Symmetry: C2
Subunit: 141 residues, 2 copies
């Protein structure tokens, strides 16, 4: 798993076309979402993660939590992101892990948001620019 | 070299604190910059690139150009980005390659902008959300 963490003033997205034939279904109100003062977690689930969904999820939960605690973000957003890796996991594994990370961050106490899987999405973000505002982490079994 | 390419409605940045003791010097007017309808090129220069600055630069020039031509972006922005790699090049090599890529994109005919090296930078971006709007490429000797 590869993750890019961005401490942001705001992050807003709008779902555009489907990238998969059968993407994640969504209500009208899940097409757009916005959070402020938010640690955005751009997550690229890999093939190698298929071997241990739960361990990988637990590490990602913890690595993301630490940074959010260190930067004093109460809000966290989980986004799927095909763009930190070339060996990517099949969608079942990807959605599995993305939901596990989403749930475990809720369990830690953050106000957590997410984006639907399997779509092209427009987004806008304002990146803060302090020293810990942009971090990347690599997570394996 | 690792590159993330983002086709954007706009990209605006503001230089904040120095990340290096001796960063790239800049006039007042280089502290902020904005472009619209722009292919932003987030570039992470690696250790392995120290071996062939010019080849690596030529490939990056071409890979970026193709995408800009394919997405019909006349504007290209080159940003240094420490966040696509763990084995990063020393700053001399990094600035060397970043300037070569900047110059060669000017030679191709794009209106090209860049950001200063060696600073923490705040930025905002609106990502387009069509299928080719977010691409990553890996470039080696």
């Amino acid at each position: 798993m590869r993750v890019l963490l961005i401490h942001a003033d705001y992050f807003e997205y709008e779902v555009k076309d489907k990238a998969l034939k059968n993407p994640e279904p969504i209500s009208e109100d899940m097409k757009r979402g916005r959070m402020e003062e938010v640690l955005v977690a751009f997550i690229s689930v890999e093939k190698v993660d298929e071997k241990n969904p739960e361990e990988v999820s637990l590490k990602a939960i913890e690595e993301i939590s630490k940074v959010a605690e260190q930067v004093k973000a109460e809000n966290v957003f989980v986004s799927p992101w095909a763009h930190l890796s070339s060996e990517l996991a099949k969608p079942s594994v990807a959605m599995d892990i993305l939901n596990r990370v989403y749930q475990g961050l809720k369990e830690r106490g953050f106000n957590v948001g997410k984006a639907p899987f399997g779509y092209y999405i427009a987004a806008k973000i304002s990146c803060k620019g302090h020293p810990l505002a942009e971090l990347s982490r690599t997570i394996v079994p």
